[PDB]
Amino acid sequence: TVAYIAIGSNLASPLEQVNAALKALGDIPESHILTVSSFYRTPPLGPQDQPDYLNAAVALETSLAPEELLNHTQRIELQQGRVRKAERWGPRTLDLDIMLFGNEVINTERLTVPHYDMKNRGFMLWPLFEIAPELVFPDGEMLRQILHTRAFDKLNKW
């Protein structure tokens, strides 16, 4: 099972955050990073200040529970020393959630299976298109198929 996550960074050197954001997965239990996309500059959506903002997905080949996986990526924000204060919709500093995970559909308290938002955004479909566009939903749709209706080639690199 692959972990399609979306990393963000603004109020803390958008480049520095991503580094320890994708490599930290190497230590995560039952988690083993496989492929890595690149850095794409794009406008965020939330509080913070909406600066340059850097986004980059990553195909984390992990077998860790679908519910605890995202839970792990969350504690990574703490290890990165994020600056919590007003994070409701925008990255603000660092927020890596599960945008796509295998095919299972589970929703706990913190874990969130393919959140109905990435399919209508660009920094979640475009980046994922690199990590693993061969992902398909239980019904019958791939992130590639989603990009067929979306067509989000934006997210101009840093």
What gap in Å lies between CA 143 and CA 3, rounded to an integer? 13
The helix/strand/coil state of 146 is helix
Point out the residues that are catalytic: 82, 92, 95, 97
By C-alpha distance, which of 135, 134, 131, 1 is closest to 63? 1
Q: Which segments of the chain are extended strands (E)?
A: 2-9, 31-36, 40-41, 54-62, 97-101
